Design an enzyme around this catalytic site. Structure first.
Site, PDB file in Angstrom:
ATOM      1  N   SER A  42      30.677 -43.799  24.999  1.00 26.07           N
ATOM      2  CA  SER A  42      31.959 -43.768  25.758  1.00 26.07           C
ATOM      3  C   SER A  42      31.831 -44.521  27.087  1.00 26.07           C
ATOM      4  O   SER A  42      32.872 -44.759  27.699  1.00 26.07           O
ATOM      5  CB  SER A  42      32.434 -42.371  26.064  1.00 26.07           C
ATOM      6  OG  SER A  42      32.969 -41.726  24.925  1.00 26.07           O
ATOM      7  N   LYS A  45      34.033 -47.502  27.778  1.00 32.96           N
ATOM      8  CA  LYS A  45      35.475 -47.372  28.110  1.00 32.96           C
ATOM      9  C   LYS A  45      35.718 -47.939  29.509  1.00 32.96           C
ATOM     10  O   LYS A  45      36.845 -48.356  29.794  1.00 32.96           O
ATOM     11  CB  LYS A  45      35.933 -45.922  27.978  1.00 32.96           C
ATOM     12  CG  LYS A  45      35.796 -45.399  26.559  1.00 32.96           C
ATOM     13  CD  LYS A  45      36.141 -43.966  26.346  1.00 32.96           C
ATOM     14  CE  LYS A  45      35.798 -43.552  24.922  1.00 32.96           C
ATOM     15  NZ  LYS A  45      35.877 -42.092  24.719  1.00 32.96           N
ATOM     16  N   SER A 102      38.053 -39.172  28.198  1.00 34.10           N
ATOM     17  CA  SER A 102      37.271 -39.856  27.140  1.00 34.10           C
ATOM     18  C   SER A 102      38.026 -39.820  25.809  1.00 34.10           C
ATOM     19  O   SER A 102      37.388 -39.717  24.752  1.00 34.10           O
ATOM     20  CB  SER A 102      35.889 -39.295  27.010  1.00 34.10           C
ATOM     21  OG  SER A 102      34.970 -40.338  26.687  1.00 34.10           O
ATOM     22  N   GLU A 138      36.511 -47.264  18.123  1.00 37.29           N
ATOM     23  CA  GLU A 138      36.196 -45.834  17.963  1.00 37.29           C
ATOM     24  C   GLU A 138      36.601 -45.374  16.577  1.00 37.29           C
ATOM     25  O   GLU A 138      37.664 -45.742  16.091  1.00 37.29           O
ATOM     26  CB  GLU A 138      36.966 -45.017  18.985  1.00 37.29           C
ATOM     27  CG  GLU A 138      36.629 -45.363  20.409  1.00 37.29           C
ATOM     28  CD  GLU A 138      35.275 -44.857  20.873  1.00 37.29           C
ATOM     29  OE1 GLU A 138      34.930 -45.093  22.048  1.00 37.29           O
ATOM     30  OE2 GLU A 138      34.562 -44.266  20.075  1.00 37.29           O
ATOM     31  N   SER A 209      28.405 -39.729  24.765  1.00 35.42           N
ATOM     32  CA  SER A 209      27.400 -39.259  23.801  1.00 35.42           C
ATOM     33  C   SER A 209      27.723 -39.807  22.419  1.00 35.42           C
ATOM     34  O   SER A 209      28.849 -40.288  22.182  1.00 35.42           O
ATOM     35  CB  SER A 209      27.243 -37.766  23.824  1.00 35.42           C
ATOM     36  OG  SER A 209      28.457 -37.101  23.568  1.00 35.42           O
TER      37      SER A 209
HETATM   38  C1  LIG Z   1      32.223 -40.917  24.248  1.00 32.86           C
HETATM   39  O1  LIG Z   1      30.931 -41.011  24.307  1.00 32.86           O
HETATM   40  C2  LIG Z   1      32.954 -39.766  23.593  1.00 32.86           C
HETATM   41  N1  LIG Z   1      32.195 -39.290  22.464  1.00 32.86           N
HETATM   42  C3  LIG Z   1      31.918 -40.102  21.462  1.00 32.86           C
HETATM   43  O2  LIG Z   1      32.174 -41.309  21.566  1.00 32.86           O
HETATM   44  C4  LIG Z   1      31.263 -39.486  20.221  1.00 32.86           C
HETATM   45  C5  LIG Z   1      31.907 -40.039  18.970  1.00 32.86           C
HETATM   46  O3  LIG Z   1      31.238 -40.220  17.962  1.00 32.86           O
HETATM   47  O4  LIG Z   1      33.188 -40.369  18.966  1.00 32.86           O
HETATM   48  C6  LIG Z   1      31.329 -37.984  20.184  1.00 32.86           C
HETATM   49  C7  LIG Z   1      30.220 -37.153  20.492  1.00 32.86           C
HETATM   50  C8  LIG Z   1      30.546 -35.743  20.336  1.00 32.86           C
HETATM   51  S1  LIG Z   1      32.192 -35.638  19.873  1.00 32.86           S
HETATM   52  C9  LIG Z   1      32.503 -37.342  19.812  1.00 32.86           C
HETATM   53  O5  LIG Z   1      34.223 -40.262  23.188  1.00 32.86           O
HETATM   54  C10 LIG Z   1      35.104 -39.346  22.537  1.00 32.86           C
HETATM   55  C11 LIG Z   1      33.263 -38.656  24.607  1.00 32.86           C
HETATM   56  N2  LIG Z   1      32.177 -38.583  25.582  1.00 32.86           N
HETATM   57  C12 LIG Z   1      31.333 -37.394  25.311  1.00 32.86           C
HETATM   58  C13 LIG Z   1      30.389 -37.052  26.395  1.00 32.86           C
HETATM   59  O6  LIG Z   1      30.708 -37.412  27.581  1.00 32.86           O
HETATM   60  O7  LIG Z   1      29.335 -36.429  26.168  1.00 32.86           O
HETATM   61  C14 LIG Z   1      32.283 -36.237  24.969  1.00 32.86           C
HETATM   62  C15 LIG Z   1      32.982 -35.677  26.222  1.00 32.86           C
HETATM   63  C16 LIG Z   1      31.558 -35.159  24.162  1.00 32.86           C
HETATM   64  S2  LIG Z   1      33.506 -37.009  23.957  1.00 32.86           S
END
Ligand SMILES: *C(=O)[C@](NC(=O)[C@H](C(=O)O)c1ccsc1)(OC)[C@@H]1N[C@@H](C(=O)O)C(C)(C)S1
Ligand SMILES: *C(=O)[C@](NC(=O)[C@H](C(=O)O)c1ccsc1)(OC)[C@@H]1N[C@@H](C(=O)O)C(C)(C)S1
Lengths: 260, 263
Positions: A42, A45, A102, A138, A209
């Site tokens: 993320s 972004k 996010s 995504e 993540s």
């Molecule tokens: C960006 O990193 C984030 N999460 C993802 O991109 C992951 C995906 O596969 O889409 C994901 C991990 C757990 S659930 C989705 O974009 C949605 C967000 N950033 C993460 C973080 O800061 O740790 C979140 C807040 C868990 S979601």
């Protein structure tokens, strides 16, 4: 001091840690695997929102433009976009959702506005970042497969770019201020870099993540009474199903903050 | 009776070196899970929700109130003023002060909300008006965070604060416009990701207010929208025997995880 401490933290973590600090007081740096590629997840972004801000410098009403949110657009993490399905959000609202919550649907609308992942990379090149690459939308940009260069950058490249975006002149004055406002309003950051810093310091950041327990944070930091820092902490692990380790990012930041 | 969930919270508390208070309301069935639910804890910054809500209540009979300017003077700055310090020798509106108090935990902003309510007792009066007989605010920032064991000042119970947060965010304690504004502000909190949020599935939506102070006091109060079910309200309060104790946001995350696993 700092190198021994970051190596020790990495060994303890069992994973692969990337750190890049820029101290704008004196332009000193703290690098650890600073030139290795890591999956951005993320944290990418920030580049997508910054690329739309740059477009808005010449398309003066662009941030007011309504964008259709369809049921079929929703992906795997849509805390804002799910509220607006079968309606519209503006590009400003999508930028804020992508950065502060996010939202992955919001990120996909930023990517589409730029003509696809390649349009995000083109913006990186336009501001002198020859390392960053966005390849996928995504949610597949988060696969974080070891050895896969897709959707990666290096800590050194990302710290330098984040400096140019937030403290330098990659963006116009209004657009830089808007990016900094958005990052300071992040909701997702309290367990990551800022958990390792004194509470008196102001932080704007973007976390991420993904698979392989990938746990990331990129931050601009205003310490009390001194010039800002830029800090990238990237972390990824051997097992596809590994747990997140925001504590490792906090620990890296705490080591950095001790060492100045 | 002691439930499976209460036994897990007891084991977490025993390992924690402090005193843990939990209250869950599951609005799917309006059932409660309590752990030390009727013991008092220092609220610290979680008190800012009651102050912001009291000003939202005032705004129901003054459409323009949230646009009313408040002077910020150099003398007003206290110990944690990330927003107010930018506006010294200028003004902030009551909306700006509410947002700063809730989303950044600005202590100068909280003091302006308290002053708009006529002092700490004005915040307590609002609590009584919405059926909270437990909440008390006795001091301004920053002294309301001394968190001294046994001190009743600036305390509530987990049970009382969960019920109040439910009435404010999901019930009819505020007008619909004002309820929506409070939920928007809480959902935009910047300080919560290490606390209740850290113990819940990523797909669940959270709005919350954290706090900390002396005696390693570490607090969070949250409204939670689970994936596929009615919202929860969760209070997690934690305090420790030594004045200089470190914060333990991980203990709040652990309590939230036990609650989530027990649903
Ligand atoms: C960006 O990193 C984030 N999460 C993802 O991109 C992951 C995906 O596969 O889409 C994901 C991990 C757990 S659930 C989705 O974009 C949605 C967000 N950033 C993460 C973080 O800061 O740790 C979140 C807040 C868990 S979601
Ligand atoms: C509210 O709890 C908070 N902090 C305090 O009230 C403390 C004080 O004594 O004023 C304090 C502890 C460390 S620095 C100031 O109000 C400013 C905020 N909430 C804390 C939290 O969530 O842990 C912060 C974010 C540390 S500051």
């Amino acid at each position: 001091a700092v190198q021994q401490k970051l190596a020790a933290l990495e060994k303890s973590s069992g994973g692969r840690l990337g750190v890049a600090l820029i101290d704008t007081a004196d332009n000193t740096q703290v690098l650890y695997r600073g030139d290795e590629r890591f999956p951005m997840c993320s944290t990418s972004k920030v580049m997508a929102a910054a690329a739309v801000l740059k477009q808005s410098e010449t398309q003066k009403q662009l941030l007011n433009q309504p964008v259709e949110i369809k049921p079929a657009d929703l992906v795997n993490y849509n805390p804002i976009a799910e509220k607006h399905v079968n309606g519209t959000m503006t590009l400003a609202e999508l930028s804020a959702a992508a950065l502060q919550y996010s939202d992955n649907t919001a990120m996909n609308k930023l990517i589409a506005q730029l003509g696809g992942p390649g349009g995000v990379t083109a913006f990186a090149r336009a501001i002198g970042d020859e390392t960053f690459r966005l390849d996928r939308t995504e949610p597949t940009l988060n696969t974080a497969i070891p050895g896969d260069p897709r959707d990666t950058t290096t800590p050194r490249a990302m710290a330098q770019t984040l400096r140019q975006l937030t403290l330098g002149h990659a963006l116009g004055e209004t657009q830089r201020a808007q990016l900094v406002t958005w990052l300071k309003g992040n909701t997702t950051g309290a367990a990551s870099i800022r958990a390792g810093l004194p509470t008196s310091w102001t932080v704007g950041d973007k976390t991420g993540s993904g698979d392989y327990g990938t746990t990331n944070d990129i931050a601009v930091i205003w310490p009390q009474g001194r010039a800002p820092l830029v800090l990238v902490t990237y972390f990824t692990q051997p097992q596809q199903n590994a747990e997140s380790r925001r504590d490792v990012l906090a620990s890296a930041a705490r080591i950095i903050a001790e060492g100045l």
